[PDB]
Amino acid sequence: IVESPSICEGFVQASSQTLVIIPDNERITSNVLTTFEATRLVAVRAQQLAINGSTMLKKKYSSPIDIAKQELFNRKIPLLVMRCIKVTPEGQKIVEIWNPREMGIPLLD
């Protein structure tokens, strides 16, 4: 018989996940940044420079956007790209972590 609802169901809070990072030699996505990814990296870095201002860039620029662009082009940007591949029903979150300081940059300057 199908009786009254129990506490075992009715949970609204989804269970926590485990971040599963694909080993670097098994990554399938491209080693080249997309234009979306490079734009997002530059925007995030520029906003964080507007917050902090601390950079390891040798040259001097008057705008956060210029500093972020030169950090991306000179491979000195302190950010990582996480490409979420899958969410497994057993709880795992399989992702790929990409280092933009050793990827191909599509942008020009």
Binding site: T35, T39, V42, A43, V44, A46, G53, I65, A68, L107
Partner: protein
């Protein structure tokens, strides 16, 4: 704070946000309705017209192909990004090039 209500500050303190005027070289989103194509919103470099008698948005006639526009009475919208994140995205993604 308004800028007329403060005049005793010799300089600005690091961390403040200054809302400055739009100058030549700023990027702007430039839109004509109906927005049927992806080029219906494009980012242009602003040239400020110093003549106070000019009230129109002026553009090159070869830029009309992006917006399906002409000069028989069309009106186009223009907003200038102010946040850094949207102002980065205007240059790198939405430029009319």
């Amino acid at each position: 704070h308004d800028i007329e209500g403060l005049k005793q500050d010799f300089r600005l303190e690091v961390g403040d946000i200054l809302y400055r005027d739009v100058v030549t070289g700023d990027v702007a989103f430039f839109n004509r309705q109906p927005s049927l194509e992806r080029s219906s919103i494009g980012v242009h470099r602003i040239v400020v017209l110093e003549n106070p008698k000019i009230s129109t948005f002026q553009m090159n006639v070869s830029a009309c192909a992006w917006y399906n526009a002409d000069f028989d009475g069309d009106q186009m919208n223009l907003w200038v990004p102010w946040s850094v994140m949207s102002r980065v995205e205007a240059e790198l993604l939405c430029s009319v090039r």
